[PDB]
Design an enzyme around this catalytic site. Structure first.
Site, PDB file in Angstrom:
ATOM      1  N   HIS B 351       6.832  59.247 -90.198  1.00 53.13           N
ATOM      2  CA  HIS B 351       6.460  59.835 -88.906  1.00 53.13           C
ATOM      3  C   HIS B 351       7.160  61.158 -88.545  1.00 53.13           C
ATOM      4  O   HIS B 351       6.895  61.717 -87.483  1.00 53.13           O
ATOM      5  CB  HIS B 351       6.688  58.817 -87.783  1.00 53.13           C
ATOM      6  CG  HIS B 351       5.902  57.554 -87.942  1.00 53.13           C
ATOM      7  ND1 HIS B 351       4.632  57.398 -87.431  1.00 53.13           N
ATOM      8  CD2 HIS B 351       6.209  56.384 -88.549  1.00 53.13           C
ATOM      9  CE1 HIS B 351       4.187  56.189 -87.721  1.00 53.13           C
ATOM     10  NE2 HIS B 351       5.128  55.552 -88.397  1.00 53.13           N
ATOM     11  N   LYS B 542       5.073  64.002 -72.682  1.00 48.04           N
ATOM     12  CA  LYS B 542       5.577  63.484 -73.957  1.00 48.04           C
ATOM     13  C   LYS B 542       7.100  63.458 -73.844  1.00 48.04           C
ATOM     14  O   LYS B 542       7.665  64.078 -72.946  1.00 48.04           O
ATOM     15  CB  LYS B 542       5.159  64.360 -75.156  1.00 48.04           C
ATOM     16  CG  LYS B 542       5.514  65.845 -75.040  1.00 48.04           C
ATOM     17  CD  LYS B 542       4.282  66.692 -74.759  1.00 48.04           C
ATOM     18  CE  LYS B 542       3.725  67.368 -75.998  1.00 48.04           C
ATOM     19  NZ  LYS B 542       2.809  66.551 -76.837  1.00 48.04           N
ATOM     20  N   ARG B 543       7.765  62.757 -74.756  1.00 47.39           N
ATOM     21  CA  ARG B 543       9.228  62.713 -74.749  1.00 47.39           C
ATOM     22  C   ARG B 543       9.825  64.126 -74.830  1.00 47.39           C
ATOM     23  O   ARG B 543       9.226  65.032 -75.416  1.00 47.39           O
ATOM     24  CB  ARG B 543       9.747  61.818 -75.882  1.00 47.39           C
ATOM     25  CG  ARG B 543       9.434  60.332 -75.694  1.00 47.39           C
ATOM     26  CD  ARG B 543      10.299  59.710 -74.604  1.00 47.39           C
ATOM     27  NE  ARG B 543      11.712  59.692 -74.990  1.00 47.39           N
ATOM     28  CZ  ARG B 543      12.382  58.608 -75.372  1.00 47.39           C
ATOM     29  NH1 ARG B 543      11.789  57.420 -75.411  1.00 47.39           N
ATOM     30  NH2 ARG B 543      13.662  58.714 -75.714  1.00 47.39           N
ATOM     31  N   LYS B 548       9.303  69.965 -79.502  1.00 42.84           N
ATOM     32  CA  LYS B 548       8.065  69.896 -78.715  1.00 42.84           C
ATOM     33  C   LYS B 548       7.932  71.094 -77.768  1.00 42.84           C
ATOM     34  O   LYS B 548       6.853  71.357 -77.232  1.00 42.84           O
ATOM     35  CB  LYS B 548       7.985  68.580 -77.940  1.00 42.84           C
ATOM     36  CG  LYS B 548       7.689  67.365 -78.817  1.00 42.84           C
ATOM     37  CD  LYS B 548       7.821  66.086 -78.011  1.00 42.84           C
ATOM     38  CE  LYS B 548       7.775  64.830 -78.868  1.00 42.84           C
ATOM     39  NZ  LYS B 548       6.417  64.541 -79.430  1.00 42.84           N
ATOM     40  N   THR B 650      -0.357  62.106 -80.731  1.00 42.10           N
ATOM     41  CA  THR B 650      -1.463  61.230 -80.338  1.00 42.10           C
ATOM     42  C   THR B 650      -1.880  61.496 -78.893  1.00 42.10           C
ATOM     43  O   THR B 650      -3.039  61.279 -78.525  1.00 42.10           O
ATOM     44  CB  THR B 650      -1.123  59.740 -80.501  1.00 42.10           C
ATOM     45  OG1 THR B 650       0.105  59.459 -79.820  1.00 42.10           O
ATOM     46  CG2 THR B 650      -1.005  59.362 -81.975  1.00 42.10           C
ATOM     47  N   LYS B 654      -5.699  61.823 -76.821  1.00 39.37           N
ATOM     48  CA  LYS B 654      -5.995  61.232 -75.507  1.00 39.37           C
ATOM     49  C   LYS B 654      -6.587  62.259 -74.539  1.00 39.37           C
ATOM     50  O   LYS B 654      -7.553  61.966 -73.831  1.00 39.37           O
ATOM     51  CB  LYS B 654      -4.740  60.599 -74.891  1.00 39.37           C
ATOM     52  CG  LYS B 654      -4.058  59.535 -75.747  1.00 39.37           C
ATOM     53  CD  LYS B 654      -2.714  59.101 -75.141  1.00 39.37           C
ATOM     54  CE  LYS B 654      -1.836  58.411 -76.188  1.00 39.37           C
ATOM     55  NZ  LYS B 654      -0.477  58.071 -75.664  1.00 39.37           N
TER      56      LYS B 654
HETATM   57  O1  LIG Z   1       7.569  58.432 -81.876  1.00 36.96           O
HETATM   58  C1  LIG Z   1       8.112  58.737 -82.939  1.00 36.96           C
HETATM   59  N1  LIG Z   1       9.348  58.320 -83.260  1.00 36.96           N
HETATM   60  C2  LIG Z   1      10.114  57.547 -82.470  1.00 36.96           C
HETATM   61  O2  LIG Z   1       9.790  57.124 -81.357  1.00 36.96           O
HETATM   62  C3  LIG Z   1      11.485  57.183 -83.055  1.00 36.96           C
HETATM   63  C4  LIG Z   1      12.078  55.967 -82.688  1.00 36.96           C
HETATM   64  C5  LIG Z   1      13.322  55.599 -83.203  1.00 36.96           C
HETATM   65  C6  LIG Z   1      13.961  56.456 -84.099  1.00 36.96           C
HETATM   66  C7  LIG Z   1      13.376  57.668 -84.468  1.00 36.96           C
HETATM   67  C8  LIG Z   1      12.132  58.041 -83.948  1.00 36.96           C
HETATM   68  N2  LIG Z   1       7.492  59.498 -83.848  1.00 36.96           N
HETATM   69  C9  LIG Z   1       6.118  60.009 -83.591  1.00 36.96           C
HETATM   70  O3  LIG Z   1       5.191  59.101 -84.228  1.00 36.96           O
HETATM   71  C10 LIG Z   1       3.816  59.376 -83.839  1.00 36.96           C
HETATM   72  C11 LIG Z   1       2.945  58.284 -84.480  1.00 36.96           C
HETATM   73  O4  LIG Z   1       2.740  58.561 -85.877  1.00 36.96           O
HETATM   74  C12 LIG Z   1       3.390  60.810 -84.242  1.00 36.96           C
HETATM   75  O5  LIG Z   1       2.103  61.110 -83.683  1.00 36.96           O
HETATM   76  C13 LIG Z   1       4.419  61.867 -83.795  1.00 36.96           C
HETATM   77  O6  LIG Z   1       4.106  63.127 -84.409  1.00 36.96           O
HETATM   78  C14 LIG Z   1       5.851  61.416 -84.160  1.00 36.96           C
HETATM   79  O7  LIG Z   1       6.821  62.340 -83.666  1.00 36.96           O
END
Ligand SMILES: O=C(NC(=O)c1ccccc1)N[C@@H]1O[C@H](CO)[C@@H](O)[C@H](O)[C@H]1O
Ligand SMILES: O=C(NC(=O)c1ccccc1)N[C@@H]1O[C@H](CO)[C@@H](O)[C@H](O)[C@H]1O
Ligand SMILES: O=C(NC(=O)c1ccccc1)N[C@@H]1O[C@H](CO)[C@@H](O)[C@H](O)[C@H]1O
Ligand SMILES: O=C(NC(=O)c1ccccc1)N[C@@H]1O[C@H](CO)[C@@H](O)[C@H](O)[C@H]1O
Lengths: 811, 811
Positions: B351, B542-543, B548, B650, B654
């Protein structure tokens, strides 16, 4: 099958069957192909529970409309046991459920065995609270039980190599179908902080907050459609608690530890901070709830007309200064008015005269945890001592004796003194105990305020302790005198006219034999122990304490063994001696006594010369559910505390109701039991309280008894030499040393009279007809010991409410 | 009311009403006089839940009989959100429940707002798992989601003085009606201990035991009567745990802390022991459950034919050595056979390419906690490196690069390398991301085993993300092309024939305006903030992460403000700029960015010269339920990550589905979105990945942009001088310093193109008709981004199973 268990009507059974199937599907998410016995238990529990709902809602609605005086029973312990069968009994559903489950291809008795005991108590005090709840509902009182929802109750006892091991009682593992969480009624409780004095009164600031979340359990009355509430508080951290981030969340456990575990120490007061937190937690949450309900009924003059608070021992004693705090600091009442209200609403019940059990909290602990309460306690003390000084001018020693504040190495608050000062009624739990209170430990207080001191002899509920656990006996009684006795136990007196009835004599003896066979079978299945069902069942079950003198029982058992070894071909009445009970984890001597009992069994049970003439069995994990099995099976009830030490006892009453004869000292309620049945129908032995006092004046010298009684000498030599511990010869040296040099309870002093009395028991057992006639005389005079009688007396003489046997309209 | 929400038949509504009343009485123990909105929510939840039961039992029974290949989706995160509306949608119960509640005098929408989000995830990765579960059920796959039941999910975000505060998410406070505890299926998990080598293999001994108790949640498919299971493990201490007595009981919390809280750090790998315990806990319990189910179907050759395990990132990577452990140590398979089975059952999804997020566990931590697993990892590495040596003889640097063991200060295990070695398939989550994997970080592995590497472009479920959150849009679409598109999103292409339809253009624009009014009203009620509904809704949710580039958005906002202050009487398209998202608690820079956004709002929102032409709002506590409100209301979707950093995204999908236009870089799935819609219908700007690479070769110098762009210079001077922080002039010095000297993400490099592109957005918004036509072209080509498409590809290309749209028979 039997009459007392109610009707099994066609529409009732059909409805129960479909609701059972509904719950199995929708509630448990199971089908008949994958369902286990536990699933079937839960399906039945939910089906029965449904029948409580309408009655519970309308009972509480009825109290809102009628607005009667409310009774609040405050206890740190509610020893409830199992709920399924009790609920069926009180709702008259037992036969209907038996039939419904039978038609489904299930054994209801098997399903009942799956339920976990709600073991939220240690023993007598906790079980009294439970019987009281049942009686209050049966007598139609607007009563509420308030306590703590411990996630772990009294530990499960395992015996390993003859020693007690403690195991966590994870009673909520599979869920508790009988409770209803009420998170919407959560209340804050405050700890620590400091006191600020502003122009308008004191203010308690900078406190730590713990939330109290209530869980409500229904308490059904016997066939009267009354369902009262037991509300138990659970500790929750606030969401901004400690709020690096992860640690703050993990630290929430510290606040929630308040309701984690029941303190199992029923012998010695330890003064632990967590216990003090538990005591304040229950008091603070409860009092808010009480006041909220009262304001919904501005003026607190009517408070005592609408509220009674009963304190079960000193454990909830902080209710007194907490009520004062709320009234003075928050409601802004003047001190004198607030004090008047407080005294008139509060009452205190004492359960022991033994000094080591009495709560005496270090001032430094209260200073830190509850600084405002300490200030209030000091003011109460000052005003109380001013009254004492006016009543007894110049009596300076009375002033130090009566003070709520005890001086010494560490300053302490005597919580019993606090309770007497702040209550309009103080009671003991049996006539002899209540008299001892007035003559000894509370003498000064009795002289100051004689009107406060009362007796309320303990009782047991005849629903759980006869109808539920002994349906065979209940049925043969009902055949003769009808069913009214179940809620009017004095009607048992009518059985006196059947003492010469040959059919009844035969029936009473038959029921006992069936109970003994049933219990002998239970022992083989769940514990793999073999007992002779034709032997006399000699039973001592209760918590392990020096004052209860399990050790005296032990000496008799060894005496019997030694006598058999001396004259092997001489006939003796066969006995199964059963001793059971838990020891407080830190009580060394009690743990040694358990080891002794098992050690005796190892020798006695494997001696070929003894055969099946004598067996010594330790009953593992004694608890309410086990009591319901063993008590109906007993022939001889051992109630052998040193005179003046057992405040009442309640196990004694359970045995009397179920067809056992009693060997006992003139202690606690034993005195009143012998009075009711007649002394000729009781096996009374040993020193009376006066004899104990006389021996204390002289000084107790155990060596004298050792020197004069050869049979006693032999036993002590056997213990000392390693006869009962060949691999560890000096294992029992602590026990011998205590018996010989530091025995507070005078075991040797009652030895000879006890052994002689036991011979008289064996002689009577040789005459089955006369044994049973004496049993009938006991059962017939057990009426006084119904907790219905006890509660009626509390109601009339302390709470100022009238009991009612009137039905509420059916839902 | 609307067609897509199903039928409200007379018998259905009548039945729902009575079952609602039944639950209110028997389940909640309430009556209409005392019931609150929360009580009504729970009554409705239980009523709807009942409808899942039959379907759930027969789905699981169907899998037992048919014995299909089972899919196990392993994730530490499942970001589920609310369940009530989703369940109604998938069961076609929405209109029926709406009518039933209406006739009871209740507003269902009001009741829906009471439900707590199940926030068991951080963001994209956790939400992907949730969409995947929905799609797997809809496509009739025998799929199981396995995770952890955290008692506290992602923290609730409070904004205090412009700063993020974290508050515990106590989501289980009032209970979770959607789960079913299964204490009967509890499994042991082992930690610590040591390895013993006996004649017959290795043995893992002297371990600490923690119990894993499963809770099952139903996952309904869309109108196909399939109900799959999500099983989440909860940590429980054994009853003999630590078994002075009191402390032993209190210490049970230590074992149970494993499932206490979700780790909220989605930016930086920390290497905490508790996190490693969580990862093993889920893996160990899950694998036992998998093997148990497989043995019930001796020979493990068929294991990969019946089991697929999908690893969501490296978080459950311990599945690989755990499967080897069970097969070798317990089942006694030879290593080579066990390895064959393991590779064929496991697959891994990546990811992110950012190095700081990658899991690299210290060897010393694994040595202590999981000594047997470390040994297995070493053997895997040795055998893997022997293969590399044979394939690339003499390439010693490749050997160090590809090793699972990383040397240095502390030795570490690279979990991504472990996953590649032990999986038959490795996939990225968008075409560009999957290509970057093969070209950069996994290049060596791609050269060794090209066949392993795949792409599976992410998707979102059109049930939650269209039908549920935007019923207005769903309805106008259904009016034209029917209802089939809800489970076949490619049918949206048929809307291309309506791009010149004047009625449809009007309807699309009407739905958007209603959504904007609805959201503007929500902001006033729950947050007391006032916004102009006629303005362009410019949204970045988003986070909070540097990659980002919320900061780039911030620079544009200040540019707009400065331009207004420069020429106040010049017309500009009114904008509401909304930024929302949580920052990881330890991520200092992200916390500073939140403060900056609020600080900009304080200046901009209170400037009288600006009026209602520009508003900057920070959206507090962004979560799934808030996304369902804000996304349908958006006009402009901000997807502005530095090219090559956002693996997919994602949120972007949406927004596209709900009628927003996208301003974005050619990053992640943005590339494929522009490809589907046509580049003319997308607002693409900025460096491509190749341009970023070229800038890196030269070296990025931010000062160059500062020197050459006067409008950029002004902003930095404003930040530095204290224009946005008058009381704390140097508050944002960390932000300025990073931008000027240490900016990994090249914010300044994309500034000019971004501002210019934003001007083109405003120009189009001035032409409502042409804006909406472009919107229609986006909605119509969003079909590819259904998670149904994504899952069908996983099924066919990785799992070796065929999806099915065939209904299961109605209960
Ligand atoms: O959300 C995360 N990662 C975390 O939340 C996470 C959690 C714990 C440790 C490290 C990352 N990654 C996200 O996963 C989505 C689904 O594939 C992608 O669309 C996105 O580009 C990516 O940053
Ligand atoms: O725990 C109880 N108990 C009772 O309903 C009850 C009823 C009568 C007597 C005792 C308990 N009810 C519970 O209330 C929760 C929260 O509303 C529901 O989710 C759950 O399904 C239900 O069993
Ligand atoms: O059971 C207790 N006490 C405790 O369990 C206890 C618990 C905590 C601390 C101290 C004592 N006391 C018992 O209370 C019953 C009921 O009145 C009496 O019959 C009995 O004589 C007495 O010893
Ligand atoms: O928690 C659930 N959940 C479900 O029944 C359920 C059903 C369908 C879908 C999701 C959950 N049921 C609960 O099972 C316990 C223990 O048997 C009962 O005491 C309780 O009354 C009941 O609500």
């Amino acid at each position: 099958q039997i009459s007392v268990r109610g009707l099994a009507g066609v529409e009732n059974v059909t409805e129960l069957k479909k609701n059972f199937n509904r719950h199995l599907h929708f509630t448990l998410v199971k089908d008949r192909n994958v369902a286990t016995p536990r699933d079937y238990y839960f399906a039945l529990a939910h089906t029965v529970r449904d029948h409580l709902v309408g009655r519970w809602i309308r009972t509480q609605q009825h109290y809102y409309e009628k607005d009667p005086k409310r009774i609040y029973y405050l206890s740190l312990e509610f020893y409830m046991g199992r709920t399924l069968q009790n609920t069926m009994v009180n709702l008259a559903l037992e036969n209907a459920c038996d039939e419904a489950t039978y038609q489904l291809g299930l054994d209801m008795e098997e399903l009942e065995e799956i339920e976990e005991d709600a073991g939220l108590g240690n023993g007598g005090l906790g079980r009294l609270a439970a019987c009281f709840l049942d009686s209050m509902a049966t007598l139609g009182l607007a009563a509420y039980g308030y306590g703590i929802r411990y996630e772990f109750g009294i530990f499960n006892q395992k015996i390993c190599g003859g020693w007690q091991m403690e195991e966590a009682d994870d009673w909520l593992r599979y869920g508790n179908p009988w409770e209803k969480a009420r998170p919407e009624f959560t209340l804050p409780v405050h700890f620590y902080g400091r006191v600020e004095h502003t122009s308008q009164g004191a203010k308690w600031v900078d406190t730590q907050v713990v939330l109290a979340m209530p869980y409500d359990t229904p308490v059904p009355g016997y066939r009267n459609n009354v369902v009262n509430t037991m509300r138990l508080w659970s500790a929750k951290a606030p969401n901004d608690f400690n709020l690096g981030y992860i640690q703050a969340v993990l630290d929430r456990n510290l606040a929630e530890n308040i309701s984690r575990v029941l303190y199992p120490n029923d012998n010695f007061f330890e003064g632990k901070e967590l216990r003090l937190k538990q005591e304040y937690f229950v008091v603070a949450a409860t009092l808010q709830d009480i006041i909220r309900r009262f304001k919904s009924s501005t003026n607190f003059d009517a408070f005592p007309d609408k509220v009674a608070i009963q304190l079960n021992d000193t454990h909830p004693s902080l209710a007194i200064p907490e009520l004062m705090r709320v009234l003075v600091d928050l409601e802004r009442l003047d001190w004198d008015k607030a004090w008047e209200v407080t005294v008139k609403t509060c009452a205190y019940t004492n359960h022991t005269v033994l000094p080591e059990a009495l709560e005496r909290w270090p001032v430094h602990l209260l200073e830190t945890l509850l600084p405002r309460h300490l200030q209030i306690i000091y003011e109460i003390n000052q005003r109380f001592l001013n009254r004492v000084a006016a009543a007894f001018p110049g009596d300076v020693d009375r002033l130090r004796r009566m003070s709520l504040v005890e001086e010494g190495a560490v300053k302490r608050i005597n919580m019993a003194h606090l309770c007497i000062a702040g209550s309009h009624a103080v009671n003991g739990v049996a006539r002899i105990h209540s008299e001892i209170l007035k003559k000894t430990i509370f003498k000064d207080f009795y002289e100051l305020e004689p009107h406060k001191f009362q007796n309320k002899t303990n009782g047991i509920t005849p629903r759980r302790w006869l109808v539920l656990c002994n349906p065979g006996l209940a049925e043969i009684i009902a055949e003769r005198i009808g069913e009214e006795y179940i809620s009017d136990l004095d009607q048992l007196r009518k059985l006196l006219s059947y003492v010469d009835d040959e059919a009844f004599i035969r029936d009473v003896a038959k029921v006992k034999q069936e109970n003994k066979l049933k219990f002998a079978a239970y022992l083989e299945r769940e514990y793999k122990v073999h007992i002779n069902p034709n032997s006399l069942f000699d039973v001592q079950v209760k918590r392990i304490h020096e004052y209860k003198r399990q050790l005296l029982n032990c000496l008799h058992v060894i005496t019997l063994y030694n006598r058999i070894k001396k004259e092997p071909n001489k006939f003796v009445v066969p006995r199964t001696v059963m001793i059971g009970g838990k020891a407080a984890p830190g009580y060394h001597m009690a743990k040694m006594i358990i080891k002794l009992i098992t050690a005796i069994g190892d020798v006695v049970n494997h001696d070929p010369v003894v055969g099946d003439r004598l067996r010594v069995i330790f009953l593992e994990n004694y608890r309410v559910s086990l009591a319901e099995k063993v008590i109906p099976a007993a022939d001889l009830s051992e109630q052998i505390s040193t005179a003046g030490t057992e405040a009442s006892g309640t196990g004694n009453m359970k045995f009397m109701l179920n067809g056992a004869l009693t060997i006992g000292t003139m202690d606690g309620a034993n005195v009143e039991m012998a009075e009711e049945a007649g002394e000729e129908n009781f096996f009374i032995f040993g020193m009376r309280v006066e004899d104990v006092d006389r021996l204390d004046q002289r000084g107790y010298n155990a060596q004298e008894y050792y020197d004069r009684i050869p049979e006693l000498r032999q036993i002590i030599e056997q213990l000392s030499s390693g006869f009962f511990s060949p691999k560890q010869p000096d294992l029992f040296k602590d026990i011998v040393n205590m018996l010989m040099h530091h025995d507070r309870f005078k075991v040797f002093a009652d030895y000879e009279e006890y052994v002689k009395c036991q011979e008289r028991v064996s002689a009577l057992y040789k005459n089955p007809r006369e044994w049973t006639r004496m049993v009938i005389r006991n059962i017939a005079t057990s009426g006084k010991f119904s907790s219905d009688r006890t509660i009626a007396q509390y109601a009339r003489e302390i709470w100022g409410v009238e009991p009612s046997r009137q039905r509420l309209p059916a839902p």
